[PDB]
Design a binder for this molecule. Sequence first.
Ligand SMILES: CC1(C)OC(=O)N(c2ccc(-c3cnc(N)c(-c4ncccn4)c3)cc2)[C@H]1c1ccccc1
Ligand SMILES: [Zn+2]
Length: 212
Amino acid sequence: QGTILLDLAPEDKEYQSVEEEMQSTIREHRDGGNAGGIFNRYNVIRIQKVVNKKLRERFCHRQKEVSEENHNHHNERMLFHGSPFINAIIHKGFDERHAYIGGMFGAGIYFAENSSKSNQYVYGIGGGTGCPTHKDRSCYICHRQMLFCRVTLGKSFLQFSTMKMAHAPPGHHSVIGRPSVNGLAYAEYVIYRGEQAYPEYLITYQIMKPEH
Ligand SMILES: CC1(C)OC(=O)N(c2ccc(-c3cnc(N)c(-c4ncccn4)c3)cc2)[C@H]1c1ccccc1
Ligand SMILES: [Zn+2]
């Protein structure tokens, strides 16, 4: 009972595959690097597979209900997630009860294909006040954490804005906020049921300073 974190050896193919997806999904943001920091590569310090029997079962049960409703298509995808609550998530699983309508966000759990997008949220909306110790959004000292999870999207509802939503629209199971020239630059993937995502990998890392 409870979660078991298993370290992967950097020689393991799985490890290598998770780190390349993360390093290669780094993009520039019209941020000036304000939110997530200035860098063009990560120092992956650790990758652990999150093993939890109960969470895997809740996940598989919900995936069945979604397939039934989506013509036997659960439409699963591997996506990143960044937030100050990773440690609670890896233990109790994703919980929609901690999501609220506010700002540009609705009351759901947001995910991203670009790890640099998830990095912007590791310390809070807009990066918050940065790391706890140095209150620096571009801190190269403190260790950050993000999750590469399995996400059951089922039938997604394509929109431009994700604020104002409490649940997926009728007949749907997830919402996708898409690129608008006066809105998002990258797609946002939202679920309103924590059981629709399984935190497969726990990534410990740091952003590295641009080399001179
Ligand atoms: C914008 C937002 C909706 O995007 C997310 O993905 N958020 C989010 C909110 C809440 C959780 C969450 C999901 N499962 C949990 N188990 C816990 C959690 N458990 C115990 C104590 C504190 N948090 C929190 C995960 C993500 C929200 C978020 C809010 C603030 C900062 C970063 C992200
Ligand atoms: Zn720091």
